[PDB]
Design a protein around this ligand. Structure first.
Ligand SMILES: Nc1ncnc2c1ncn2[C@@H]1O[C@H](COP(=O)(O)OP(=O)(O)CP(=O)(O)O)[C@@H](O)[C@H]1O
Ligand SMILES: [Ca+2]
Ligand SMILES: [Ca+2]
Ligand SMILES: [K+]
Ligand SMILES: [Mg+2]
Length: 994
């Protein structure tokens, strides 16, 4: 606990009784846990109230059905309806479908959150501390840190606790504290006290708050507070939903439902108007009110029928399902749209190092100069074993293990690698492995120096912990690191200003030790070191050095190379201004070349494959990297971005070549080129922007801060689980796995969610069109009513519920990942599909009117009215416009009506079977591809039998139908709806477009 940011660095150390560079003792840490608990928010708990989710009524169309059930509860309250109790059933025929879909939605959402909360909590967050039990910095669980220990944070890292800054190891320290202060741009920090105890967080310029991200620099501090006492800890419970509105496709379908509410409203008022000339009819006694209310009920019931009441849930559901399936592949979704958006991505831009490659770095080759004589230059090359970060392996020259100390060129080589380096190693005792602290490229240098052991230090009798940094520490005692010119991606190098260590001889020379991209560094060299000697840089020397770099970077190991140099005579510190990072390059001039290291960095296994799948899916993959163009092109080949022997001259570019191009040509280069190299963070962003200017959906994958701008800019930003917190922050998805395959999977899922939404709509429209075609084809062709209000509400409950929602669990189409991506501004509803909605809607409306007719006309138990309907309904009371006045009322017989209600239910459950796939046949895509659908169909048919044969029920709805031969007819008329779509799918297949 520390109340103050207003106390000085010394006072904070004194308060906790801690040595700045050693950190807490094991006993101190024991005390501090007990007194302060673990560094974590207990919270964890309660996302959405069981109730909250229940309240996914509130939606567009569900509220309509809600109101629709009110009028039924009020019309029932006034003793009637028409038949007394049949009016209290109505309200519950409407609630039921709503409650059914609500249950499925709530369930899928709960499962989703669970799955996601499982994935998020899986891998433990880590921190870096100095603690007394170890000399070099170590990694602990962030949960285990307490007030008082010395913590190290660097560019990329998330600040793990509230920290009072002790020492800034770079020339500046920039922090992204948006999450806490709203402050959109990163802010500078210092170590001077801030007097005001009153002061607001933005004035705490010497503190780092848990949960923020370091944007630039490296610092050291002491933890003031942890857990709930955290500045961000205090404020969690509170905020008016920094939570959000719905996804593009959701807003699209919402909009589509909105204008469907128009067309249905109209057709409904039209039913009420096309009739109520049947107002005064003998059915309701002829009152000038009763018939108006009845046909008003026909309207309302027809409305609840036509309205896709489950559209709002099926999407909410397919989303939560897509998340839950991503989480099962170890993808964290931070933003709902990600899966759909990736659905129609045509270009995936990808970082190389850490993303396309493992970022498990290993120096396996190096060289220094051997001889220089006229235009003859020779190199002493060396190999190094050990691929892991473990200080175990040998230096070989001509296949024999050597003692690196033998070569003075290697002594300095190792010196630079050790001093010019902000990273280190730490031995994990539990896992039993040497793990990096900081950047891989640097940690590889660390492990290299432990293998070169150039001053012959005695390391065999050390613990695995101590062995991890021992030779590096030896070097650190040789020289005092006065300060460092932090790496920057414009100069592509890093610097360190050093003086000899005991101060014994206080002017034998300060030095700067430099490492960087070979091309930039070699150009700023005027001397080449030869052993302990120095000679001018010349053309032939430079050419030698560079050709071996070309060799290593392009050969079969594809080595990531770095050059190491020293500045023999540095400027005086007083001539050096540390304020403007843009002067660092001049300070790193007049250098002496020492050597080069070549690093192994294997491509991930799953990549080559993932890329093929992209090609097939019509998705372009582009490598984007700071690294050399040689090594990047070679890797692209090894990955399949380029073939092993393609001319790549105009489809690979450096930042410099790309900048040399006119804007028009830059944009065009982005369309053909698949490899961009030696490129800065601003270029990564610009390439993504260019792609987006062809109105394409662009994804960016990465891991470092050099990728955040591009990650923010792309439609979907995907961060590696192994990468930086700042990459993760700027992302919409995170691959905790680091598994690149998942990106392709997520593409397929987003594609499939789309397709599922389609079939759901196709099913409902084409079916609910038939339901309306029916009422209108009777009232116009001049027939008796086929259905009643409650009978309309029944087909709704039983055709528009679970059999529809179930389509959302359709399996992916067979070719879903073999067509190009969809354009995002494509007509939701295709012109050809609208015709298919009608061709199906027509057969359904005609098969149901033609069914009630067959009962009257060609049916043995029916009266034999024979063709021409006998021409009217007029008959009324006893024997009228005497046209075979044989049978009186048969109209109002339940028989014709419950015939139609059964063709309607049966036939709707039939074209649901064609809604498994847009254009695939039931022959290639059987009904059992979706079981969830089949079970829902049974529940419907089953519910529909129950209503027919459980005696109290048939009264409330209206009398049954002869099992044996009536059903044979319903099933004879309904079944062909399958055969029709199947010829219609044949059309859209063996002729094609889309
Ligand atoms: N800590 C460091 N010190 C000195 N030079 C470094 C360095 N890290 C990287 N470099 C050099 O700077 C170049 C540019 O780095 P940058 O971060 O832009 O690309 P990168 O190759 O490091 C990663 P990516 O492939 O993910 O773009 C590297 O290719 C390497 O030559
Ligand atoms: Ca409906
Ligand atoms: Ca329906
Ligand atoms: K983005
Ligand atoms: Mg990277």
């Amino acid at each position: 606990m520390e109340a103050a940011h207003s106390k000085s660095t010394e006072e904070c150390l004194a308060y906790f009784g801690v040595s700045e560079t050693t950190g807490l003792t094991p006993d101190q840490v024991k005390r501090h846990l007990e007194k302060y608990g673990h560094n974590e928010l207990p919270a964890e708990e309660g996302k959405s109230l069981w109730e909250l989710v229940i309240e996914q009524f509130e939606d567009l169309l569900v509220r309509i059905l809600l109101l629709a059930a009110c009028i039924s509860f009020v019309l029932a309250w006034f003793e009637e309806g028409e038949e007394t109790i049949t009016a209290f059933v109505e309200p519950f025929v409407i609630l039921l479908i709503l409650i059914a879909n609500a249950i499925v939605g709530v369930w899928q959402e709960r499962n989703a959150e669970n799955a996601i909360e499982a994935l998020k909590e899986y891998e433990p967050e880590m921190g870096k501390v100095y603690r007394a039990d170890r000399k070099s910095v170590q990694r602990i669980k962030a949960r285990d840190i307490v007030p008082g220990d010395i913590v190290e944070v660097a560019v990329g890292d998330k600040v793990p606790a509230d920290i009072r800054i002790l020492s800034i190891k770079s020339t500046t320290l920039r922090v992204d504290q948006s999450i806490l202060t709203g402050e959109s741009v990163s802010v500078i920090k210092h170590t001077e006290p801030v007097p005001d105890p009153r002061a607001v967080n933005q004035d705490k310029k010497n503190m780092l708050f848990s949960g923020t991200n370091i944007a630039a620099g490296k610092a050291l501090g002491i933890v003031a507070t942890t857990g709930v006492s955290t500045e961000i800890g205090k404020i969690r419970d509170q905020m008016a939903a920094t939570e959000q509105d719905k996804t593009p496709l959701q807003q699209k379908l919402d909009e589509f439902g909105e204008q469907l509410s128009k067309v249905i409203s109209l057709i409904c008022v039209a039913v009420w108007l096309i009739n109520i000339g049947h107002f005064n009819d003998p059915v309701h006694g002829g009152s000038w009110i009763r018939g108006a209310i009845y046909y008003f009920k026909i309207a309302v019931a027809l409305a609840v029928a036509a309205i896709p009441e489950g559209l709002p849930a099926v999407i909410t559901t397919c989303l939560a399902l897509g998340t839950r399936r991503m989480a099962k592949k170890n993808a964290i979704v931070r933003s709902l749209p990600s899966v759909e958006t990736l659905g129609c991505t045509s270009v995936i831009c990808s970082d190389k190092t850490g993303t396309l490659t493992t970022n498990q770095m290993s120096v396996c080759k190096m060289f220094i100069i051997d001889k220089v004589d006229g235009d003859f230059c020779s190199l002493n090359e060396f190999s190094i074993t050990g691929s892991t970060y473990a200080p175990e392996g040998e230096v070989l020259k001509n296949d024999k293990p050597i003692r690196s100390g033998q070569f003075d060129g290697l002594v300095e080589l190792a010196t630079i690698c050790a001093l010019c380096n902000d990273s280190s190693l730490d031995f994990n005792e539990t896992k039993g492995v040497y793990e990096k602290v900081g950047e891989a490229t640097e940690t590889a240098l660390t492990t290299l120096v432990e293998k070169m052991n150039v001053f012959n230090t005695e390391v065999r009798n050390l613990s695995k912990v101590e062995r991890a940094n021992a030779c590096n520490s030896v070097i650190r005692q040789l020289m005092k690191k006065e300060f460092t010119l932090e790496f920057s991606r414009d100069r592509k190098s890093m610097s360190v200003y050093c003086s000899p260590a005991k101060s014994s001889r206080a002017a034998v020379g300060n030095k700067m030790f430099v490492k960087g991209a070979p091309e930039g560094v070699i150009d700023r060299c005027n001397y080449v070191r030869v052993g302990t000697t120095r000679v001018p840089m010349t053309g032939p020397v430079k050419e030698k050095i560079l050709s071996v770099i070309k060799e290593w970077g392009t050969g079969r190991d594809t080595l990531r190379c770095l050059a190491l140099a020293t500045r023999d005579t540095p400027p005086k510190r007083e001539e050096m201004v540390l304020d403007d990072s843009s002067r660092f390059m001049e300070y790193e001039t007049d250098l002496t070349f020492v050597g080069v290291v070549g690093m192994l960095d294997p491509p991930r296994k799953e990549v080559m494959g993932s890329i093929q799948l992209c090609r097939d899916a019509g998705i372009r993959v582009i490598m984007i990297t700071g690294d050399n163009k040689g090594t990047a092109i070679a890797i692209c080949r090894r990955i399949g971005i380029f073939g092993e022997n393609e001319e790549v001259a105009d489809r690979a570019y450096t930042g410099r070549e790309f900048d040399d191009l006119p804007l028009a040509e830059q944009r065009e280069a982005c369309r053909r080129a698949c490899c961009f190299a030696r490129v800065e963070p601003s270029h990564k962003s610009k390439i993504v922007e260019y792609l987006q200017s062809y109105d394409e959906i662009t994804a960016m994958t990465g891991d470092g801060v050099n990728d955040a701008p591009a990650l923010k800019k792309a439609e979907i930003g995907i961060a590696m689980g192994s990468g930086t917190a700042v990459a993760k922050t700027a992302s919409e998805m995170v691959l905790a796995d680091d598994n690149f395959s998942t990106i392709v999977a997520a593409v397929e899922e987003g594609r499939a969610i789309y397709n599922n939404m389609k079939q759901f709509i196709r099913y409902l429209i084409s079916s609910n069109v038939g339901e309306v075609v029916c009422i209108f084809l009777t009232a116009a062709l001049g027939l008796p009513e086929a259905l009643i209000p409650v009978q309309l509400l029944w087909v709704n409950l039983v055709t528009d519920g679970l059999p529809a929602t179930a389509l959302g669990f359709n399996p992916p189409d067979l070719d879903i990942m073999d067509r190009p991506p969809r354009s995002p501004k494509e007509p939701l509803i295709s012109g050809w599909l609208f015709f298919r909605y009608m061709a199906i809607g027509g057969y359904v409306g005609a098969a149901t009117v033609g069914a009630a007719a067959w009962w009257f006309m060609y049916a043995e138990d029916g009266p034999g009215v024979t063709y021409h309907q006998l021409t009217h309904f007029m008959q009324c009371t006893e024997d009228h416009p005497h046209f075979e006045g044989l049978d009186c009322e048969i109209f109002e017989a339940p028989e014709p009506m419950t015939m139609a209600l059964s063709v309607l239910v049966t036939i709707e459950m039939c074209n649901a079977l064609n809604s498994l796939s847009e254009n695939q046949s039931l022959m290639r895509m059987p009904p059992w591809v979706n079981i969830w659908l089949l079970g829902s169909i049974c529940l419907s048919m089953s519910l529909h039998f129950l209503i027919l044969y459980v005696d109290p029920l048939p009264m409330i709805f209206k009398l049954k139908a002869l099992d044996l031969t009536q059903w044979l007819m319903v099933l004879k008329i309904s079944l062909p709806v399958i055969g029709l779509d199947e010829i219609l799918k044949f059309i859209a297949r063996n002729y094609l477009e889309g």
